[PDB]
Amino acid sequence: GPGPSLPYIQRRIREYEVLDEEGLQLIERNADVVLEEIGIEFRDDAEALDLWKAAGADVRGQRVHFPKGLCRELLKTAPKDFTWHARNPERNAQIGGKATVFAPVYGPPFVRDLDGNRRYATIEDFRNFVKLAYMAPSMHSSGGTVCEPVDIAVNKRHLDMVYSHIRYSDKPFMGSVTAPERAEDTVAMAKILFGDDFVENNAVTLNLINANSPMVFDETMLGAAKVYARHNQACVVSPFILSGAMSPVTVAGTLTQILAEVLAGAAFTQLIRKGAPVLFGTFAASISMQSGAPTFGTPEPSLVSYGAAQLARRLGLPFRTGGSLCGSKVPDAQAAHESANTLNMTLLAGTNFVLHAAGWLEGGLVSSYEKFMIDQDQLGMMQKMAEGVDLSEDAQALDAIREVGPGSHYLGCAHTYRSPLADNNSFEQWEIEGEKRIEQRANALARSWLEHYEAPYLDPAIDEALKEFIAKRKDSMPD
Amino acid sequence: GPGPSLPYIQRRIREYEVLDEEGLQLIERNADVVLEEIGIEFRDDAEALDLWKAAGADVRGQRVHFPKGLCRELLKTAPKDFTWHARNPERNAQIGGKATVFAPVYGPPFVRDLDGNRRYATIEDFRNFVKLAYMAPSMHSSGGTVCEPVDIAVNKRHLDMVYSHIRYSDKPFMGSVTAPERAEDTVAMAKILFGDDFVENNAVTLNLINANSPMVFDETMLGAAKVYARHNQACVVSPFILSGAMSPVTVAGTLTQILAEVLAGAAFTQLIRKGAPVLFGTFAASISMQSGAPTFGTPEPSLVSYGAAQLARRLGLPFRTGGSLCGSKVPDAQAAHESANTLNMTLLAGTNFVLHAAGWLEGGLVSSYEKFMIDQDQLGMMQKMAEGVDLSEDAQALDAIREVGPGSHYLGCAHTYRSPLADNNSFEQWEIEGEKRIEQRANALARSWLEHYEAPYLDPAIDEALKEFIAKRKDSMPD
Ligand SMILES: [Cl-]
Ligand SMILES: [Cl-]
């Protein structure tokens, strides 16, 4: 199996910037214009409209028009950083500041299984991804909807999904957002696990709250946000954008829209509870001008995300974007270039929370076991990169340079990250070993990890209470 | 075929830094210590030793010990930037400053051909790579030893290699460095092409001058450097390092050794001719602690190269490092992650000259047609990325945001880089089209490009004179 899990990354390296002060001010000014003149829809949520009117916004039907600065002022109560608590406290993760936390793929209804089949995902696959995330040394979070399990009823599956993050991992996990009652169920389960007062006082979940970009928040998302914000749980407020389709085709226009959507949605959390933890999220990709298809790994989404990180730091919210994203159907060089381009930006932008750090394929439709293994290996490289350059006397190596001297070599001397998947052997050895592509070695490694997996301890009293809760909830509803 | 070729990149984006002022001063101070106490070998070149003694260095056998600051002072005459002239002046490339110039793979004795065979490279393959580099829109240079042609005698092949860069391309090219007489032949050919006085006054070649790291320059390399520096041609002074083997295993120790080697070798060019153009080069990879094998795409080489770029800017020399480097045997996700990690650093470090920007596979032993096509596509993305964020009124897109408004989409409106190799189609379409990996599409595209290729015009009088020169030189030697 793998080594021990590493804690969250603390970046010693700098954030890479694409906008100068004038550009940042321009985008900020333009977002305030959008918020006042155009507004943001808060749909099918009368309570939300009442909250906005009370806060001093101008509500016209379902469109909320914001006085300049209001959202930013309301966000003064949001924490710049906070702890995401894990049931094993050694796995707690900082969200914000110099920290970077990797989480798995979220959302796919299909898997590419270890036998090469593209098929609907099941609870068995969900559990397998939870297991692999538990074992992956640089996967800091267990995640959320690692895949969508087809073989449990839609109104019940959330219970099994949350349970899986508790039973098969001890890393911090995400909650259900698919209906407000499911968010309530997540909170109830969390209270069984951590204690009632503990949950009211500490974030134990991050929860994905998408905007229906452009410039709409819908009932379901607002409903989950209201539950989590009332219980001190974190909302990842995330525009969902393909530039050219759900936002302008340009970087600057996309950033402006993103900032407007985040200001409104994040400020909303503070209207529910001052101090509720909230992140500035962004999902941003491009479209093919030929096809209209979603495209990844291209320059425009990287520039958007670098810029958005700058805007997030200035707003004072922890930032989520990026991951190992791609549009390829197979874990080939396209998948890898796209994922690598996105992941390198993710680290260098100083991203605090990385959804989709491993496992995404096919534009988000697939959770791939092989891809997960390849990506998690990259995550270990990013974790090591983030430590930056050691400048200790030993690292300076002057005695080694002296002792070796010109014309010698350093292999023998005392002074003199490791991928388990890269093949660094000669052609001849690699040909003897079956001319294998990396995904074949990834397949074998996933199988090996799953064979050696041992579940982290769970108090049997807590397990029983969770199972009793789940059973009661399932019995209260027909499928 | 492809679109028109683009000129050299002018970066509008910032350089990413890994060392702060104290760290930079530390490395600079430590390199001066190495140069004085340990020295650098200049082997089997009595003239070089005499030049160093005359300049005020302390020569002990073949070891040159340098007073502190001497090399840096001598380098004051080296140009911070210069033009690399092409026979078609529209293809001239700036070397230095904010410019970035991509060149092909250099060195492999094997190819992976379009039929999938790993075999010794031939002059036909050399020509094919020159053709593909001519056509690739973001390949700014024709390169040098795009592969090593096995089917021409070792003492003659340089003539055909240089000729190929003239006949099949009009982009700036590199010279032969394999013996001093071959460098003389390159200069003679260049004078036939551009004119005698033109060559003495303008760089028309960049020429790879490796150190035999650690801390040795050998006769052959010094001999080529002496020829090119006397004729105003550029030397790319390049440590050749696997950290842990040819330099210390640490980043800081590697950087110190690199800076010492470059200071000595680059200053040497100014002893031959003040003002001779010279680059700070670095080839830097790691080794597998298990195997001892060369490894790429890992954190340590990226940190070395980011740092080395900082040291190069402070020294005042144009910088070469990076490229699309990897150790994989096949153009798979390993090849792509490694190449992408290296290439993203290459751009963000502000690299001026990128050897090996496309085509390298198998740790430098292979020039791959498929890999070249995949990599050159990435180069187009890097070219577009380098332009940074447009902040024009049109790019701000406020009228588009207004006209679309919340709940609509931007696909239809007036306001609303393209890979020819990414598959961005649905699973269903991609399955109908043969479940193809990107390298299969790359194969087809290379074949298509080579079918449509038309050689750039060459004056028949110049062609005849080159052929007469070549024939005379070949007839003067047995193979
Ligand atoms: Cl059930
Ligand atoms: Cl011949």
Which of B9, B361, B410, B433 to substitute to test the interface with A, most A CBs within 10 Å?
A: B410
Backbone dihedral angles phi then psi of residue A30, each to the nearest 5 degrees: -65, -35
In the numeric block, the tokens 């400053």 are attached to B97
Question: DSSP H helical segments within B168-275, as ranges?
Answer: 180-194, 196-201, 219-230, 251-272
- Give the nearest partner residue to B214 out of A26, A37, A408, using CB atoms: A408
Give the Cβ contact number of residue A274 at 10 Å: 12
Cα angle B156, B162, B167; round to 5:
120
Closest to B28 (Cα-Cα) out of B180, B255, B228: B255
Residues sharing a CB contact under 8 Å with residue B431, sequence separation 6 or more, in sequence order: A329
Cα(B156) to centroid(ligand 2), Å: 6
Q: What is the DSSP letter of B475?
A: H
Angstroms from B451 CA to nearest CA on chain A = 25
Angstroms from A172 CA to nearest CA on chain B = 27
Ligand closest to Cα of B474 equals: 2
Q: Which residues of B touch A59 (CB under 8 A)?
A: none
- Give the nearest partner residue to B397 out of A252, A297, A402, using CB atoms: A252
Cα dihedral across residues B128, B130, B136, B139: positive or negative: positive
Q: Cα A310 to chain center, whole Å?
A: 18
Angstroms from B292 CA to nearest CA on chain A = 8
Question: What is the three-class DSSP state of B138?
Answer: coil
- Asked if A340 and B335 come within 8 Å (Cβ–Cβ), the reply is no
Q: How many structural domains comprise chain A?
A: 1
Cα(B470) to centroid(ligand 2), Å: 9
Q: Which residues of B touch A409 (CB under 8 A)?
A: 214, 245-246
* DSSP for B183-207, written as a single string: HHHHHHHHHHHH-HHHHHHSB-EEE
Residue B428 and residue B432: Cα distance in Å, rounded? 6
- Asked if B340 and A341 come within 8 Å (Cβ–Cβ), the reply is yes
Its domain, for residue A183, covers 1-479
- Asked if A405 and B40 come within 8 Å (Cβ–Cβ), the reply is no
Q: Which residue of A has its CA nearest to B385?
A: A299
Cα(B152) to centroid(ligand 2), Å: 5
Backbone dihedral angles phi then psi of residue A86, each to the nearest 5 degrees: -110, 155
How is residue A56 written in tokens? Answer: 């001093």
Closest to A360 (Cα-Cα) out of A285, A302, A300, A440: A285
Angstroms from A455 CA to nearest CA on chain B = 30
- Asked if A407 and B63 come within 8 Å (Cβ–Cβ), the reply is no
- Give the nearest partner residue to A410 out of B247, B327, B431, using CB atoms: B247
Residues sharing a CB contact under 8 Å with residue B270, sequence separation 6 or more, in sequence order: B74, B75, B77, B78, B276, B278
- Give the nearest partner residue to B18 out of A378, A388, A398, using CB atoms: A388
Q: Residue A59: what residue type?
A: V
Ligand closest to Cα of A123 equals: 1
Q: Which residues of A touch B337 (CB under 8 A)?
A: 336, 339-340, 374, 378
How is residue B168 written in tokens? Answer: 């099949």
- Asked if A410 and B216 come within 8 Å (Cβ–Cβ), the reply is no
Q: Which residues of A touch B339 (CB under 8 A)?
A: 337
Ligand closest to Cα of B158 equals: 2
Beta carbons of A307 and A341 less than 8 angstroms apart: no
Question: What is the three-class DSSP state of A122?
Answer: coil
Indicate the length of chain B as a whole number. 479
Beta carbons of B72 and B35 less than 8 angstroms apart: no
- Asked if A333 and B331 come within 8 Å (Cβ–Cβ), the reply is yes
List the beta strands (DSSP E) in A154-296.
173-174, 205-210, 216-217, 234-238, 240-242, 278-281, 283-287, 294-295
Cα(A153) to centroid(ligand 1), Å: 6
Cα(B117) to centroid(ligand 2), Å: 25
Angstroms from B409 CA to nearest CA on chain A = 5
Q: Which residue of B has its CA nearest to A390?
A: B252
Residues sharing a CB contact under 8 Å with residue B305, sequence separation 6 or more, in sequence order: B282, B284, B321, B322, B345, B346, B349, B351
Which of B332, B411, B421 to substitute to test the interface with A, most A CBs within 10 Å?
A: B332
- Asked if B34 and A401 come within 8 Å (Cβ–Cβ), the reply is yes
Determination technique used: X-ray
Which run of H or of E encompasses A193?
helix A180-194
Residue A64 and residue A291: Cα distance in Å, rounded? 34
Question: What is the three-class DSSP state of B356?
Answer: coil
- Asked if B299 and A385 come within 8 Å (Cβ–Cβ), the reply is yes
Give the Cβ contact number of residue A290 at 10 Å: 8
Residue B101 and residue B355: Cα distance in Å, rounded? 9
- Asked if B397 and A248 come within 8 Å (Cβ–Cβ), the reply is yes
Beta carbons of B82 and B204 less than 8 angstroms apart: no
Beta carbons of A242 and A214 less than 8 angstroms apart: no
Question: What is the three-class DSSP state of A36?
Answer: helix
CATH number for position A95: 3.20.20.480
Strands B9-10 and B205-210: unpaired
CA distances from B49 to A402, B67, B218, B221 (A): 22, 15, 12, 15
- Asked if B396 and A425 come within 8 Å (Cβ–Cβ), the reply is no
Residue B141 and residue B359: Cα distance in Å, rounded? 14
How is residue A427 written in tokens? Answer: 């052609």
Which of B37, B334, B346 to substitute to test the interface with A, most A CBs within 10 Å?
A: B334
- Give the nearest partner residue to A389 out of B244, B307, B427, using CB atoms: B307
Which of B219, B329, B330, B360 to substitute to test the interface with A, most A CBs within 10 Å?
A: B329
Ligand closest to Cα of A151 equals: 1
- Asked if B293 and A401 come within 8 Å (Cβ–Cβ), the reply is no
Which of A42, A424, A430 to substitute to test the interface with B, most B CBs within 10 Å?
A: A424
- Give the nearest partner residue to B333 out of A14, A34, A374, using CB atoms: A374
Residue A289 and residue A293: Cα distance in Å, rounded? 8
Cα(B461) to centroid(ligand 2), Å: 22
- Asked if A40 and B406 come within 8 Å (Cβ–Cβ), the reply is yes
A142: burial class by Cβ within 10 Å (0-12, 13-18, 19+)?
Answer: buried
Residue B423 and residue B427: Cα distance in Å, rounded? 10
How is residue A207 written in tokens? Answer: 């929860």
Angstroms from A336 CA to nearest CA on chain B = 5
Cα angle B211, B217, B220; round to 5:
95
Which of A240, A289, A330, A332 to substitute to test the interface with B, most B CBs within 10 Å?
A: A332
- Asked if B435 and A329 come within 8 Å (Cβ–Cβ), the reply is yes
Residue A351 and residue A330: Cα distance in Å, rounded? 27
- Give the nearest partner residue to A245 out of B302, B411, B418, using CB atoms: B411
Strands A278-281 and A283-287: unpaired
How is residue B370 written in tokens? Answer: 């498929």
* DSSP for A408-475, written as a single string: --STTSTT----SS---S-HHHHHHTT---HHHHHHHHHHHHHHH--PPP--HHHHHHHHHHHHHHHH
- Asked if A427 and B394 come within 8 Å (Cβ–Cβ), the reply is no
For this entry, resolution in Å reads: 1.6
- Asked if B293 and A424 come within 8 Å (Cβ–Cβ), the reply is yes
